[PDB]
Structure formats: structure tokens, C-alpha cells
Amino acid sequence: GRENLYFQGMTTAKTPETLLSVAVQVFIERGYDGTSMEHLSKAAGISKSSIYHHVTGKEELLRRAVSRALDELFGILDEEHARVGTAAERLEYVVRRMVEVLMAELPYVTLLLRVRGNTGTERWALERRREFDHRVAALLKDAAAEGDVRADVEVRLATRLVFGMINSIVEWYRPESGVSGAGEREVVDAVARLVFGGLRK
Template identity: 55%
Template sequence: MAGAATNNGAGRGRPGYDLDSLLRTAVKVFHERGYDGTSMEDLAKRLGITKSAIYYHVSSKQELLRMSVDRALDALFAVLDEPESLEGPAIDRLHHVVRRSVEVLVDELPFVTLLLRVRGNSKVERQALARRREFDHLVGELVAEAERAGSLRLDLDPALTSRLLFGMVNSVIEWYRPRQGLTKEEIAEAVTTIAFEGLKRHD
């Protein structure tokens, strides 16, 4: 999961200082004050370090944003490369992608939350939106493939279906808080059960 951050920071790490903590704190402050409302000075104060200690790791606030949203995107795209996403009937691959996406969302909650709030106000944000659209497109293709294979209800439009499916997945960021008693597996199970089997009991 930390692949993006680790790769982007390759060669820049300094013993005793942690890029992961820097990103986590930056994202927390972005959520509290808004990205535009946060200065590198604010971040330095919150971290209890100097601005130059931050610049040792990243060149700008934009780079902090890029590394944070890439962390979420890399984790989501990694799901599409898992063997269960690549082999077997389309309906089972779709099921796997939905289940694992919920787990990634819980694992990388602050980073995915930041990603989902990006509105395209800068180059970094537009690149993130483009990667999100690519992810949505790939999921949409999987839905269409499952439909062609006859595994889905025929009365549903694939594009609308994938939007609603990921609408339910992404809604988890609105209420999920760590340590509230639900595991990521329980949430993923509830999402996939509702989405694939439906709420209604059929005896």
C-alpha cells in the first residue's frame, strides 16, 4: 500500500524521519483547513519541524498532494492487477474488485478521502481525475463483460451500474471511522452481498 510513497521518496529518505508520517499529517491538515487554506508553515508547525525539513522530502505542497492522491490511486490500480481480477468469469472478477476496493478504501482512508474530494483545480488534481476516470472505465468494462456473459440482470445499464456500485463503495468514507468495531472484511462483505445478491431474501 505504501508503494507509491516509498517509490516517490526513493533516495530521499533520511534515517529517523518518516515520509509516511509526513504524508499522513499533511493529509489530516488538508482535511481540516482545506488544501488551499494550508501553508507549508502550517504543516511545519503541526509536525514540530522546520519548513526546510519538509523540503528535504518534497519540493512543494503540490508534490505532497500528488504523492497523497497517487498513494490512493496506486492501491486501487493494484487491485486490478491481482490474479483474482484477471482470471475467471467476469462476474467473479468484478466481485473481487468491489470487495478489494472497499478494503483499500478502509486501509488508505485519509488518502482515498482526499482523492474523492479532488475537483480539478490544478494540474495534479486533473491528473488524479484522469486516473480516476481510467479506473472507472476499467470497472465499467468489467460490468459490460459480465453482462455479455449473461451473469447480470439484463435490465441494467453497465455505465449506470458501475457508477452506483462505486457510489456505494465510496460512500464508506462518509461514516467509517477506525476503531468503531467494524472490520474492513465485514464492510466489504456487506457491500458485495447487497450489490450482488440484493437485500431481499428469496426463499
């Protein structure tokens, strides 16, 4: 109801998000497995029957969510600057873009990272993520061959650790002299600097 604000007689006033965006919020809160259709119905404010105008159930909503995350990540790999220049130039571009995508698509990427199930959708999403891993590891291998990346760390271990650094951003990053985007740029620049040069002066 309207709540008194205790200021000159003023009071407060007493679902515009999409079904997908609602579902993603519930999945992050509860975990996918722990989300029921009743949760989703109560959250979206529409009936279980009404949801069939949209999807067959929660797996389809998860699919839509992880597909959006995967499309953005794979998309990076065929962008011009991921595909031209030296292998180390392409790798650095890819790393920067992965940070950008994780910030921009944070809830979707978070769900993708959490997939640990045996539905067909989850197994597909895990397949796709392993393919993406393989792709990036090949870029790092190419940069090592070109002499631009160090040879004393195994390529797949380096790739795993670098992904650990990048993926950690979902845990801590919250969006708020450039008018906008300074905090985002700062994270991208820092990750690039630490990935390629580490902490040492």
C-alpha cells in the same frame, strides 16, 4: 506541563509521524486548497526552510498522497482473481477489494475522492480515477455479456451507483469470533451481498 491526576499524587507527563502523514491529516481537516505551508510547518513542527529537504511544497505532498491511493486501487485490477474466472467473478473480487482498500487507505482515498482542482497533480489524479472507472465499467459490461449481470440497468449507471455505495464508506467507517478484522470482513461481505443481490430475500 504535568497535570495533577488527583490520585495518590500521580500526574500526567508533559513529531514521530512522517511529513506525508502529517500533511494528509492537515489536508483532510482544512481541505487541500485551504492548507498553507504555514499550517504544514506548524503541524509538522519544522521550519518552511526545513521542508525543502523533503518537498517543493504542498502540491508534491498531495501528489504523493493521491499516488498512494491510486496505486492501491489500480493494483486491484491486476491481482489474479481480478484477471481469471468469469467476468462476474472478477467483478465481485474487484468490489470486495475496493472496500478493503478504502478501509486500509482511508485518508489517502478520502483525499483522492476530494480532488476538485486544476493543479497539474489534481488533473492527473482525476484522469487516473476516470481510467479506473472505465476499467471497472468494462468488467461490468463483460459480466452483462456473459449473462451474469442484469441487462435492465445501463452499465455505466450501475457502475456509478455501485461506486457511490463503496465510496460512501469513507464518511462513516472507523476502524476499531476472529481475533481481528471481523468488522472489516462484515463491511466487505455486506457490500458484496448488496451489490450483487440487493436487499430482497
